[PDB]
Ligand binder design. Structure first.
Ligand SMILES: C[C@@H](O)[C@H](NC(=O)N1CCC(c2ccc(C#Cc3ccccc3)cc2)CC1)C(=O)NO
Ligand SMILES: [Zn+2]
Ligand SMILES: [Zn+2]
Length: 267
């Protein structure tokens, strides 16, 4: 399809899940060929793998001493809507988590799309590839359509679950929230993370319990969210992606490892 920007400036604000600080976003329209980039304290940070500085519990970007935490959800929404040219101005240190899903970003951006004059030059997976990390695995193969499967093997009541996104089913993953296991929270807080995490923005699960009074939005909400996360990390290739992906227990580190191998392959 055509390259796309936003019709007008779009604003979002709220707490960041990791920093726990309040931050504000301003999504600015941009001309054809600009690409997706962040802007903080006079510095432009392109939404590309070369700018990744952290991958543990979030994908973070940095350039010239300016850092932005948790870019995955906003990038996933922009990837799904095929917004190719925008500047995301960040007043703070992290993208707001909002309700833990991409819903608010998705709804506001989809109503404000401006089609542009050039076609999208997609990042097209040309051959099969596999990346691994001690049991964890991500594979990609050619496909005319973006298809993303995530399979989890949870150590609680959820057990094994699988979910596949295909083009046209964007609404099936944009409402799936970030999640956490109660036995892992102490470690996350000890490593200086999850400061803004709560039952208002995270689906919190125990061995046999759901902490959230509203419960799960879907029986497989965690794997739908993991698919949404991978689509965000795939946008670090610098263009909307065409390929069929399968992730078995993948995370941001393995997602970025795949992205860098795909980019190197196509140099
Ligand atoms: C999903 C994954 O891929 C990942 N998030 C992840 O690993 N997180 C975010 C949530 C953090 C968190 C959330 C909630 C709480 C809390 C709480 C609480 C518990 C009981 C009662 C009241 C509040 C603590 C840390 C933990 C790490 C993700 O979405 N990456 O894009
Ligand atoms: Zn996420
Ligand atoms: Zn950790």
């Amino acid at each position: 399809g055509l390259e796309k920007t936003v019709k007008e400036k779009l604003s979002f604000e709220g707490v960041g899940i990791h920093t726990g600080e309040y931050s504000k976003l301003i999504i600015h329209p941009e001309k054809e060929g600009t690409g997706i980039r962040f802007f903080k304290n006079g510095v432009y940070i392109p939404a590309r793998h070369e700018f990744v500085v952290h991958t543990n519990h979030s994908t973070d970007l940095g350039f010239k001493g300016q850092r932005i935490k948790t870019v995955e959800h906003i990038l996933s929404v922009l990837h799904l809507l095929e917004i190719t040219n925008v500047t995301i101005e960040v007043i703070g240190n992290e993208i707001p988590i909002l309700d833990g899903s991409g819903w608010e970003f998705y709804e506001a951006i989809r109503k404000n799309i401006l089609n542009q004059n050039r076609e999208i030059d997609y990042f097209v997976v040309e051959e099969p590839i596999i990346v691994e990390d001690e049991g964890r695995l991500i594979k990609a193969e050619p496909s005319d359509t973006l298809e993303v499967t995530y399979e989890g093997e949870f150590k609680n009541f959820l057990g094994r679950q699988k979910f596949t996104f295909v083009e046209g089913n964007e609404e099936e993953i944009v409402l799936a929230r970030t999640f956490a296991f109660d036995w892992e929270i102490e470690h996350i807080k000890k490593v200086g993370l999850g400061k803004g995490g709560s039952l208002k923005n995270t689906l919190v699960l125990g061995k046999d319990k759901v902490y959230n009074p509203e419960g799960l939005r879907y029986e497989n909400e965690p794997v739908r969210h993991k698919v949404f996360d991978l689509i965000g990390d795939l946008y670090l290739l610098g263009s909307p992606v065409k390929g069929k992906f399968y992730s078995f227990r993948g995370g941001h580190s393995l997602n970025v490892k795949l992205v860098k191998e795909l980019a190197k392959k196509q140099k």
